[PDB]
Nucleic acid binder design. Structure first.
Ligand SMILES: [Mg+2]
Ligand SMILES: [Mg+2]
Ligand SMILES: [Mg+2]
Ligand SMILES: [Mg+2]
Ligand SMILES: [Mg+2]
Ligand SMILES: [Mg+2]
Ligand SMILES: [Mg+2]
Ligand SMILES: [Mg+2]
Ligand SMILES: [Mg+2]
Ligand SMILES: [Mg+2]
Ligand SMILES: [Mg+2]
Ligand SMILES: [Mg+2]
Ligand SMILES: [Mg+2]
Ligand SMILES: [Mg+2]
Ligand SMILES: [Mg+2]
Ligand SMILES: [Zn+2]
Lengths: 98, 102, 53, 213, 70
RNA sequence: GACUCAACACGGGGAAACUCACUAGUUUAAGACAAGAGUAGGAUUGACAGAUUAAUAGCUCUUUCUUGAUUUCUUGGAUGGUGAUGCAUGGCCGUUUUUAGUUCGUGAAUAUGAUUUGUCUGGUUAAUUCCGAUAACGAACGAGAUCUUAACCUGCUAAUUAGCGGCGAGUACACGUACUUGCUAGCUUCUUAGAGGAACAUUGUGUGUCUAACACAAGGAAGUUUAAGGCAACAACAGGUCUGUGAUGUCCUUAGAUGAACUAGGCUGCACGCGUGCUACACUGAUAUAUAUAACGAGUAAAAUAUGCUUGCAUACUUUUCCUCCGCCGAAAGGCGUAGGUAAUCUUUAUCAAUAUAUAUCGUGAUGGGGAUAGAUUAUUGCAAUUAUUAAUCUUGAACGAGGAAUGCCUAGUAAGCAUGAUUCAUCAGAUUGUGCUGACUACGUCCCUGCCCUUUGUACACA
């Protein structure tokens, strides 16, 4: 713990967010950067906002916004990218696909 | 065993019909049933302005949300009344069962 | 250090906002609605309020 | 343990927000309403639309995602207590929301306004509808905005009957050069249950019966 | 409303001066008298967290523990 | 921003910070993605001490440790904006207009046409509401009907978190009355709330074409559709709003930002002009004591109270945060300790107010009328009260003696007088929006002024 600047996402935070998104299928993000943490996830809310923003620009999620929330959904390329990134066997599927 | 049935709802038809059905259904079993108690009706009021902007004559509108409540007592078992209560009620009425032994 | 968002904001107009717009003006606080007046006049029917007289 | 007033307000707000979310998600599927049955055991949502097939998805894949999103937004504490069901509208020629969405979808493809309006008129009227009205407002061709009205049959405006026997919706379409508003009004074929629910007819009629002979 | 008036040039940002292979100045080893630490080691940080040899004190860059020279 | 009605206690606009859009400064990246560069022999991140800064922003400098590919530099490309445009638009609202208006089929005027008639001389109504006359005969929206609240019911259905009554034990009086208290036949007057009923101009008398209707009397809870509201046709305005909006087109701007924040200031500054109001000019009063008497309401992720340690940490989310009875302290404001209540159950309402009523003092005197402007001390909200947040005590004691030319609202439980609950709200109502209490005078009309409408008429007007 050397106390870097706020919004300097470590590798572990990104790994946790990717794991959650792959296991679960979807994610709700709550656009507000002043919240300390996510309901299901012990990470600064700004980090989740930044990562999910980055995924949408590359066409790995689809999102659409109702008043005060984000509602992201994963593509098929999202699944493939997350297998390649996280090194999971070619059998695992997200929970929505069952 | 001094069981009390309590009903609340926004709709007058709905809760009146549910009360009638419960009252008639419990009387097919020959049970001492206390007639429904209609508590005072309570109204929620908001008085807001029209006109998103601020010009023109100043007009208002008055909004109302009123709540009804019924109340039924009877001597029976817990399982009997909890079966009789639940027959997939019109889900706009709330039903809750309490034991008033004291 | 950082001086970002460090002013105390526990009370006052700067603390709460609209549940829908995020605006900070003419908020309904009665019964904890927490919607400004315009959105409420748009949504009052489905919320449960009626016009009788 | 909050009081009754706050409980009812909470139900109203939750209803409104869920409805708006679902109307945004299922735009291209003829979305028409939502019904919620909140038991403390489980809560069940019942969606109403025209195209149930493409709402459901491939072996129900889309509806599972909808359930997961609705749960993570509104029932965060638990894990599996919410499920959804899709139903199809019986008579889509009298659902104003469906007709307004259809007109929007038509107008987004560049088709002419007048043909679309006469088409929707002819479609509504053949379902037995007693009257209908369609209005389109904005920059139609020129740079100065205009309104166009299209009517058929019989329609009421004032009183309490006009709120029972008429069905209304509004939608907007973003064209390249502005926004257009769409406004549909359908009078139902003498079909309206009452506040003391029973099939009514009309507060304006005094038929006199014929003596038996 | 008006365009600014700039009479004073910009405040400059902070760059970090660079030293090539500074670690080879921290340990040096002879043939006799093997490896000898040239800076000193911390107290509550995992071993190898060295601290600055300042003009009058020693400073740990990771926990900011200051020990005054005297 | 808005400038006749239809701007000027309006933008729910009562701004100490925030809000905030304005003034003076200082930080931040929370600059997607793509391409090139740079680089593990280190891209970049953070910071003690001294200086330096309003500042405990390592902001920057000296000094020299930490960090590990998250970032950094270049060109594109997105994103945000209470920035411009309501004369580019959506939606919503105001106004014409709460008036009584608007259209269609067939026939006729045609024997060119724009277009007429139907939709009217007259009587009648709140009403193109009806009767009736008739080159027209029939239809539709608007009006009416419908909906909500109020007024009647000793008849129906009900008894809790409502009452009354029944049975005992007392405390005092008169030979039953008032109050306290333990318990619990029956009933629905009082309280609550569901279903029904009741008025139709009924009956009598008059006016009218004896049609459509109007007036008076009797009965009746009620006889101006019984009272008040909500809804609101066809057609319009360059009416207002992009400063309500992840409604939006175009134009600007985008690292020395017009993005997002942090510190201080301003929106409240005062020779003057205008609109809405509060308090008064006294005796039908002021002050002081005492008696009696309402209705609609509201109410429960953070900081805060307690061991080991040198103003900080780890700890129960075990108490507390909203209305607050009661007890004690204090002239008062208020403070301390402890109940009940997520509420027909407690605060608190067989009563939470003030006009009223009774008795005394003052005595026509800018006076014991009036209470502006100033001095001093004390409390509470808040991180912070100075340009004085609000409240408490003593002191000071201005204009004003009924208001010129002008001009507003109003017909019955109404005007006026009198207080109160909610909205905003950490703290602040002389403002809105509801509620009740005391309760008049004058008319029962007209077309004179003002406005709106219809017919005939003139027109060189049609942005009228
Ligand atoms: Mg329009
Ligand atoms: Mg009407
Ligand atoms: Mg103020
Ligand atoms: Mg904006
Ligand atoms: Mg305009
Ligand atoms: Mg407009
Ligand atoms: Mg004519
Ligand atoms: Mg009674
Ligand atoms: Mg806007
Ligand atoms: Mg500021
Ligand atoms: Mg001002
Ligand atoms: Mg005096
Ligand atoms: Mg005085
Ligand atoms: Mg105000
Ligand atoms: Mg006149
Ligand atoms: Zn809003």
């Amino acid at each position: 713990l050397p106390h870097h600047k706020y919004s300097y996402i470590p590798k572990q935070n990104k790994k946790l967010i990717y794991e959650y998104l792959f296991k679960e299928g979807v994610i709700v993000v709550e656009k507000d950067a002043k919240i300390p943490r996510h309901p299901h996830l012990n990470v600064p809310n700004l980090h989740i906002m930044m990562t999910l923003k980055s995924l949408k620009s590359r066409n790995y999620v689809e999102e659409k916004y109702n008043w005060k929330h984000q509602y992201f959904i994963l593509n098929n390329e999202g699944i493939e990218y997350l297998r390649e990134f996280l090194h999971l066997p070619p059998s695992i599927f997200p929970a929505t696909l069952s | 065993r001094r069981i009390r049935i309590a009903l609340t709802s926004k709709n007058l038809r709905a809760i009146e019909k549910v009360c009638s059905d419960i009252m008639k259904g419990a009387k097919e079993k020959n049970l001492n049933v206390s007639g429904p108690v209609r508590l005072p009706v309570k109204t929620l009021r908001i008085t807001t302005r029209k006109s998103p902007c601020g010009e023109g004559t100043n007009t208002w509108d008055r909004f109302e949300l009123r709540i009804y409540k019924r109340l039924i007592d009877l001597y029976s078992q817990c399982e009997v009344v909890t079966q009789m209560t639940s027959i997939n009620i019109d889900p706009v009425v709330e039903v809750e069962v309490i034991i008033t032994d004291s | 250090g950082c001086i970002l968002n460090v002013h105390p904001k526990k009370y006052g107009q700067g603390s709460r906002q609209c549940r829908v717009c995020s605006n900070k003006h003419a908020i309904i606080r009665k019964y904890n609605i927490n919607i400004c007046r315009q959105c409420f006049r748009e949504r009052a029917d489905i919320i449960g309020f009626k016009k009788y007289r | 343990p909050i009081s009754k007033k706050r409980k009812f307000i909470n139900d109203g707000v939750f209803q409104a927000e869920l409805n708006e979310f679902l109307a945004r998600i299922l735009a291209e599927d003829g979305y028409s309403g939502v019904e919620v049955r909140v038991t403390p055991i489980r809560t069940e949502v019942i969606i109403r639309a025209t195209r149930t097939r493409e709402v459901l998805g491939d072996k129900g894949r889309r509806i599972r995602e909808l359930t997961s999103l609705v749960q993570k937004r509104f029932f965060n504490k638990s894990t599996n207590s919410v499920e959804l069901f899709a139903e199809r509208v019986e008579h889509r020629g009298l659902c104003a929301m469906a007709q307004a969405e259809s007109l929007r979808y038509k107008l987004l493809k560049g088709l002419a306004v007048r043909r679309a309006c006469y088409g929707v008129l002819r479609h509504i009227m053949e379902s037995g509808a007693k009257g209908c009205e369609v209005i389109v407002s904005g920059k139609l061709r020129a740079q100065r905005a205009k309104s166009m009205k299209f009517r058929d049959g019989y329609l009421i405006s004032t009183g309490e009957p006009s709120k029972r026997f008429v069905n209304t919706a509004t939608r907007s379409a973003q064209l390249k050069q502005g926004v257009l508003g769409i406004k549909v009004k359908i009078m139902l074929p003498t079909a309206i249950d009452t506040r003391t629910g029973l099939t009514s007819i009309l507060p304006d009629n005094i038929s006199v019966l014929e003596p038996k002979t | 409303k008006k365009k600014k008036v700039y009479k004073k040039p910009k405040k400059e940002k902070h760059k970090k001066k660079k030293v090539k292979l500074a670690v080879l100045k921290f340990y040096k080893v002879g043939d006799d008298g093997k490896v000898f630490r040239l800076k000193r080691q911390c107290d509550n940080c995992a071993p190898g967290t060295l601290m600055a040899s300042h003009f009058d004190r020693d400073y740990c860059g990771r926990c900011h523990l200051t020990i005054m020279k005297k």
